[PDB]
Design an enzyme around this catalytic site. Structure first.
Site, mmCIF file in Angstrom:
data_model
loop_
_atom_site.group_PDB
_atom_site.id
_atom_site.type_symbol
_atom_site.label_atom_id
_atom_site.label_comp_id
_atom_site.label_asym_id
_atom_site.label_seq_id
_atom_site.Cartn_x
_atom_site.Cartn_y
_atom_site.Cartn_z
ATOM 1 N N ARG C 65 0.841 -1.209 0.000
ATOM 2 C CA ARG C 65 0.000 0.000 0.000
ATOM 3 C C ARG C 65 0.859 1.235 0.000
ATOM 4 O O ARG C 65 0.783 2.043 -0.925
ATOM 5 C CB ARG C 65 -0.888 0.103 1.230
ATOM 6 N N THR C 66 1.686 1.344 1.038
ATOM 7 C CA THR C 66 2.428 2.579 1.318
ATOM 8 C C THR C 66 3.426 2.971 0.219
ATOM 9 O O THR C 66 3.362 4.081 -0.255
ATOM 10 C CB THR C 66 3.046 2.555 2.731
ATOM 11 N N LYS C 93 27.676 -3.641 0.225
ATOM 12 C CA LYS C 93 29.130 -3.450 0.312
ATOM 13 C C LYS C 93 29.512 -2.687 1.603
ATOM 14 O O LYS C 93 30.582 -2.106 1.685
ATOM 15 C CB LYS C 93 29.607 -2.652 -0.909
ATOM 16 N N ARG C 114 10.859 4.171 5.187
ATOM 17 C CA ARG C 114 10.373 3.201 6.147
ATOM 18 C C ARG C 114 11.570 2.362 6.620
ATOM 19 O O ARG C 114 12.425 2.021 5.806
ATOM 20 C CB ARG C 114 9.273 2.339 5.513
ATOM 21 N N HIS C 142 3.362 6.031 12.142
ATOM 22 C CA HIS C 142 3.068 5.839 10.719
ATOM 23 C C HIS C 142 2.155 6.980 10.405
ATOM 24 O O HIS C 142 0.949 6.822 10.275
ATOM 25 C CB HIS C 142 2.401 4.470 10.455
HETATM 26 N N1 LIG Z 1 1.069 -1.898 6.832
HETATM 27 C C1 LIG Z 1 1.004 -1.223 8.164
HETATM 28 C C2 LIG Z 1 0.328 -2.146 9.172
HETATM 29 C C3 LIG Z 1 0.999 -3.518 9.239
HETATM 30 O O1 LIG Z 1 2.098 -3.664 8.650
HETATM 31 O O2 LIG Z 1 0.415 -4.440 9.854
HETATM 32 C C4 LIG Z 1 2.403 -0.833 8.683
HETATM 33 O O3 LIG Z 1 3.417 -1.048 7.987
HETATM 34 O O4 LIG Z 1 2.544 -0.329 9.814
HETATM 35 N N1 LIG Z 2 30.887 1.724 -6.755
HETATM 36 C C1 LIG Z 2 32.109 2.147 -7.379
HETATM 37 C C2 LIG Z 2 33.216 2.290 -6.346
HETATM 38 C C3 LIG Z 2 33.177 1.206 -5.269
HETATM 39 O O1 LIG Z 2 32.439 0.248 -5.432
HETATM 40 O O2 LIG Z 2 33.867 1.319 -4.253
HETATM 41 C C4 LIG Z 2 32.432 1.100 -8.380
HETATM 42 O O3 LIG Z 2 32.139 -0.075 -8.053
HETATM 43 O O4 LIG Z 2 32.935 1.471 -9.448
#
Ligand SMILES: N[C@@H](CC(=O)O)C(=O)O
Ligand SMILES: N[C@@H](CC(=O)O)C(=O)O
Ligand SMILES: NC(=O)N[C@@H](CC(=O)O)C(=O)O
Lengths: 307, 319, 323
Positions: C65-66, C93, C114, C142
């Site tokens: 949903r969210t 990494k 979240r 929330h």
């Molecule tokens: N979807 C809502 C309620 C639940 O997860 O039960 C929440 O993430 O807080």
């Molecule tokens: N993300 C960059 C540098 C690193 O991963 O440290 C690369 O992989 O090219």
């Protein structure tokens, strides 16, 4: 526009099966797909579906189908909300029905792919907005059938009169099921070769409901377990499929030496060794072009549905 | 407008694979175009230069900066992204690289590929009808990092010619330092390059040898060190450091040298008043948080430059 | 001709972390604005208000949903979304949370976050230039859920003041009930709150105490139970029930056990026979068997319409924050 009129019959409507289309439906979509294709290749930019949303709901993986749906939406000026199943509130115990209802709250259309065949019917039962069956188990794949048919039309010039070979896992291959249905109901097919070991032949629950149209139009139906010289010499289309001994259906440059000059090879993809890379350079290999015809067929569909 | 955002013509419709493919004039046109991109976006101005074009990311390894900035850059040009996955694809049902390329190619105007194999790029090119932008091929290159890196240096310091720069950390497997060395040495009069790493992870010969003519004609000093000595700290205009990328001797030598190659607030006391710390990111503890508040910490700004530099690239590719 | 979409001014340029940061006036203004969003989008009108603005999701635990609701809302304002995936990112990494916030903050106009750690939103705030909208912080709050939950009560029942509301289920770990109780008690004249939960999953003291002044001062009746008594069914205008938050080990087992074992909180068609004619059932979702599919036919079932409300509340929130 005068230039891109939607196919009136598809408006506000889900697409579950190839059975739901008339011969008029298909050609209206074909011509619409060609118009879309000409405008896009010129660099024209459509805003036809601005403010409208598709949500993919893929419980099985896809490269093409997802991507061509999204690109099709986008090239119509519409938008995609990227729903994933693996990083979703399915994990917390939610049901297919509630999942569907959810995305429905936000969307103008759903594109659903699922390993269970009757999952789609269940989605329809709770969905307000159109769902496009992007593959239900070993059931159907209707929009592939349509784009497959656009490909045949565009490449060979006619669909009436052809001899077509359906090769590979015909039992579990949902592509070949929609294709057979689409072609036989709405066209006058000379002959269809069903090429598969017996274990993976075209099911009766597909053939029997077509029998009246097969009989009434005098369509020939032969089963082989091999790509015999007869199949190679007579076929205007070799449509082959993945698995889901193999030598007797593999298509290679050598095998292609037996084919006519005016025919195409097609494959819904992805392919294993049933379709060798030797073939790729042959102007009769239309299985890459197929995917682009796919994008334009899907534009036609989306526009017609949501116009 | 072609006054404000003139694309860089040399880049029209072409794939970007290496730092070797650019000229000095190219790098400068892209720098100025990126800065102009920046001035517009920062003023709230919206751009629609790429309405109806699609960029498809094709990432076979993880990313935060390069994926996202590419997607953001494309959106900020008014273009679109198709969020293709490799883990949620028909690559699971036995599909190959070229077929995958030919697929995405049916749909897209430009492709962006990150792949763990070096040769994966040359394989994709041979089958692609649309430009591919290399977002990193194994331990080979990361050409657009080099470009945004050079943008960073130019905007922060004011000039690239004449600088002393240290490349630090895992120089063997660091595709970031490979592309940045080639681009600076080939296109600028670099004064000195420090190569700060243990032997096991030093800058590879296959990078250095192709540069020998540039190195001799422009008279660049190349010194290897295994530590951030006082010399390196006092003389460097740019300290560009990198994570260590994870046979036995490499692990150990890295362990032996870690504190010597780490930059933290203490080490920065020996730094010039005017200089910059850079890092393509992500970082581990080779770059202490204690440095983040320092005005010379340029590795966050660095990312924003990346977006604007990728706006310049995308627009020039697709103009 | 048409409706104006004035942004709610006080939300401009600001993070949203807690139900507490909102006044009654902000709530009605957002409500009204969400309704005008509704009437525009349902009339087919195309909104271009946030073109060239980018939203980035930074979800460190699941959502449907969210996530989907926020992306939709952004799209329907003419905005765009950068589909960043925590699980397929440079955190694998060793990248820190803060560096990841600083990364996406470099490209975005707004971040929707979240995270399972209550304090992670705090971490994020301390480094982000752009507004962060809290879309769930562990068992904490929330807050956009509370705002939409309130929209749903308003549009469906006609008033929020004067209502008797049951909060049912997992009130200990239920961030949704936390934000909603706070948001109702501080800004409305609630007649009575039933707290329907087993003892182990009851509403915590770190929510109830900050509201003590307000509860006493405004006479808000508070009744605790461990069952859907006939009283609770008969008096309540709103039955807002909730999922057992399993994801949140021996007291753990008794806490899991307590929901259905010291229960009587299932809602079904049978239990519903006892309800008022004029009332709604809500559930922020997803549900398990606490909210039977036999209620779905009931027009009093508001929990699907709620997700629609939420899209419009969220379009309102994002336009007000970003205008
Ligand atoms: N979807 C809502 C309620 C639940 O997860 O039960 C929440 O993430 O807080
Ligand atoms: N993300 C960059 C540098 C690193 O991963 O440290 C690369 O992989 O090219
Ligand atoms: N067209 C597709 O997207 N895939 C096909 C072909 C296959 O997977 O073998 C399918 O079976 O769904």
């Amino acid at each position: 526009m005068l230039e891109l009129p939607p196919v009136a019959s598809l408006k506000g409507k889900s697409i579950t099966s190839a059975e739901q289309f008339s011969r008029a439906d298909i050609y209206a979509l074909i011509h619409l797909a060609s118009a879309m294709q000409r405008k896009i290749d010129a660099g024209e930019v459509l805003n036809l579906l601005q403010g409208r949303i598709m949500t993919p709901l893929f419980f099985e993986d896809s490269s093409r189908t997802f991507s061509s749906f999204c690109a099709a939406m986008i090239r119509l000026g519409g938008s995609v909300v990227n729903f994933k199943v693996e990083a979703s509130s399915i994990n917390k115990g939610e049901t297919l029905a509630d999942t569907i209802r959810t995305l429905d709250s936000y969307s103008d259309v759903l594109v659903m792919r699922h390993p269970r065949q009757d999952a789609i019917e269940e989605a329809l039962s709770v969905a307000q907005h159109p769902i496009l069956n992007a593959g239900n188990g070993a059931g159907e794949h209707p929009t592939q059938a349509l784009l497959d048919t656009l490909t045949i039309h565009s490449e060979l010039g006619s669909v009436d009169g052809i001899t077509i070979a359906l090769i590979g896992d015909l039992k579990m291959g949902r592509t070949v099921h929609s294709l057979l249905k689409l072609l036989v109901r709405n066209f006058s097919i000379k002959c269809v070769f069903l090429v598969a070991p017996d274990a993976l032949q075209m099911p009766q629950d597909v053939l029997e409901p077509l029998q009246h149209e097969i009989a009434t139009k005098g369509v020939i139906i032969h089963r082989t377990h091999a790509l015999t010289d007869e199949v190679m010499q007579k076929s205007d289309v070799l449509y082959t499929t993945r698995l889901q001994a193999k030598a007797d259906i593999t298509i290679d440059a050598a095998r292609m030496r037996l084919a006519k000059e005016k025919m195409i090879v097609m494959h819904p993809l992805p392919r294993n060794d049933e379709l060798s890379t030797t073939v790729d350079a042959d102007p009769r290999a239309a299985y890459f072009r197929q995917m682009r015809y796919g994008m334009f067929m899907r534009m036609a569909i989306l526009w017609s549905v949501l116009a």
